[PDB]
Amino acid sequence: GKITFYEDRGFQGHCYECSSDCPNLQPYFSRCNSIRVDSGCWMLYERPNYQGHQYFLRRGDYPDYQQWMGFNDSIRSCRLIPQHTGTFRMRIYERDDFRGQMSEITDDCPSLQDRFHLTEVHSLNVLEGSWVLYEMPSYRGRQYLLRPGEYRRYLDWGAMNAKVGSLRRVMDFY
Numbered sequence: 001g002k003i004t005f006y007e008d009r010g011f012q013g014h015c016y017e018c019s020s021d022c023p024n025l026q027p028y029f030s031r032c033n034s035i036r037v038d039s040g041c042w043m044l045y046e047r048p049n050y051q052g053h054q055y056f057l058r059r060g061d062y063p064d065y066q067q068w069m070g071f072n073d074s075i076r077s078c079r080l081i082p083q084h085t086g087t088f089r090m091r092i093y094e095r096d097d098f099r100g101q102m103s104e105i106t107d108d109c110p111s112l113q114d115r116f117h118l119t120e121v122h123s124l125n126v127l128e129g130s131w132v133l134y135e136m137p138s139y140r141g142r143q144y145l146l147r148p149g150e151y152r153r154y155l156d157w158g159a160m161n162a163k164v165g166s167l168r169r170v171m172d173f174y
Contacts, residue, residue: 001040001080003057009033010063021079024048032075035062041130041170043079043145044068050077051158054143056132059173069143079145081130081170088129088169090146096122096153109167111137121164124151130170133157137165145170 006015007029016028026048035044037059046052053071062068087106094100103116112118114137124133126148135141144157154162 001042002038003040003042003078004036004038005029005032005075006034006036007031011036011061018078019080021077023050023077025076025078031073032070033065033073035068035075036060037062041081041083041172043081044075045077045079046071046074048076050079052076054145056143056145056168056170081145081147083172084129084170086128088131088171090124090126090131090167092116092118092121092164093123093125094118094121098123098125098150098152105167108169110139112165112167113137119165120162121154122162123153124157124164125149126151132168132170133159133164134166134168135159135161135163139166139168141165 002019004015004017007013011034014029037057042057044055055068057068065073089106092103126146131146133144133146144159146157151157
């Protein structure tokens with residue numbers, strides 16, 4: 001995994017290369033206005049220790065933070081999402097604590113509204129591979145990284161609401 005963070009736009013000024021998770025990037029750069037992912041899939045976070053707004057980024061050039069959906073130029077921590085080949089699988093629940101109707105999802109879902117007539121998800125279990133949960137349909141609004149484990153309440157994936165409109169498997173372009 002190789003990613004480079006730059007303080008200014010169009011890959012100008014101070015930069016820092018990273019190749020593994022880092023719960024605190026501040027000692028390496030004061031702001032982030034552009035990024036180049038040379039390899040791997042990443043989860044970036046506005047504050048250290050993996051909190052604040054989250055942004056998923058795959059290989060490519062990001063000359064300005066709007067290219068990543070950034071809320072601003074603060075990138076304080078990052079996760080190198082472990083690569084996963086084969087079957088990605090998760091189960092969504094209408095109610096918290098794994099209650100009510102459950103749906104098993106194994107592919108990207110650009111819209112839970114269209115497929116399940118669902119606006120919100122109260123609990124979820126991921127069984128294999130990491131995913132990316134988005135607040136609105138079509139991988140829009142707030143982003144949340146989901147790694148294999150139980151999420152009994154939307155707070156476990158750290159959202160501020162139960163709105164879940166889309167899901168994306170964390171996969172390289174290849």
